[PDB]
Amino acid sequence: IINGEDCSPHSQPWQAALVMENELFCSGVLVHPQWVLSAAHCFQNSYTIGLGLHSLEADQEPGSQMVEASLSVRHPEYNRPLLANDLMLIKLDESVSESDTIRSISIASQCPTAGNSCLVSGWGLLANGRMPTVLQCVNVSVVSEEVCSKLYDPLYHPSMFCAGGGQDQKDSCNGDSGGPLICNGYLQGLVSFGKAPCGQVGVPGVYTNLCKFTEWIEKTVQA
Numbered sequence: 001i002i003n004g005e006d007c008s009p010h011s012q013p014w015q016a017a018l019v020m021e022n023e024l025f026c027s028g029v030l031v032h033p034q035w036v037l038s039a040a041h042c043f044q045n046s047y048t049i050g051l052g053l054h055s056l057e058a059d060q061e062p063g064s065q066m067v068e069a070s071l072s073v074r075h076p077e078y079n080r081p082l083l084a085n086d087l088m089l090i091k092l093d094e095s096v097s098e099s100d101t102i103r104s105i106s107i108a109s110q111c112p113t114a115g116n117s118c119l120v121s122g123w124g125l126l127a128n129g130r131m132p133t134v135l136q137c138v139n140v141s142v143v144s145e146e147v148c149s150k151l152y153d154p155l156y157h158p159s160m161f162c163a164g165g166g167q168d169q170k171d172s173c174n175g176d177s178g179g180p181l182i183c184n185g186y187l188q189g190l191v192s193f194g195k196a197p198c199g200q201v202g203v204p205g206v207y208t209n210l211c212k213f214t215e216w217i218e219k220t221v222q223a
């Protein structure tokens with residue numbers, strides 16, 4: 001997160017951390033007791049998801065649960081066109097129990113509205129190019145479709161949307177991929193990509209436009 005601040009511990013209970021050998025590489029959103037939503041470009045053969053965290057130090061966070069999973073379903077059209085449909089559902093081995101610091105969030109069924117201010121959180125790089133010790137939070141506003149599509153032509157696709165890009169230099173960044181973007185308490189998008197460096201004025205970040213994959217997310221999680 002660029003130019004944000006330490007989130008209020010456990011203020012985003014749907015936040016899922018994805019760690020590899022021993023480091024964080026992505027995030028996900030608990031959209032169901034046994035399913036974590038994330039960016040297709042975060043696919044692995046097996047994940048080590050951390051729920052209920054705030055600091056990466058799992059054994060320092062109470063209600064925290066380091067579950068495991070291996071069945072991941074990337075969206076059929078991911079990366080066709082280049083970079084598009086960047087979402088993926090990861091099915092957790094053992095379903096988790098919604099605790100005090102671990103709750104799932106629902107996906108917005110309506111589409112981003114320009115100007116609307118939202119929040120995004122993650123453990124990605126900071127304004128100083130450094131990784132944070134706790135989960136970061138920042139607000140960015142939805143940018144209009146016109147500006148988005150022209151700014152990111154010809155890579156822009158309807159499965160994406162822009163947010164931020166303001167003068168305040170608030171934005172996501174590397175390590176926040178698959179992170180959540182909440183709008184009025186709904187999961188509006190996932191941290192997907194954007195120009196580098198991050199936090200450039202006039203250059204918003206791109207997020208997966210979840211409002212567009214409700215039916216798929218459903219047919220998958222359920223059936």
Ligand SMILES: NC(=[NH2+])c1ccc(N)cc1
Nearest residue numbers: 173174192193194198205
């Ligand atoms: N700066 C950004 N909004 C960004 C950087 C890496 C990435 N995967 C996604 C987005």
Ligand SMILES: [Co+2]
Nearest residue numbers: 009054061062
């Ligand atoms: Co805590």
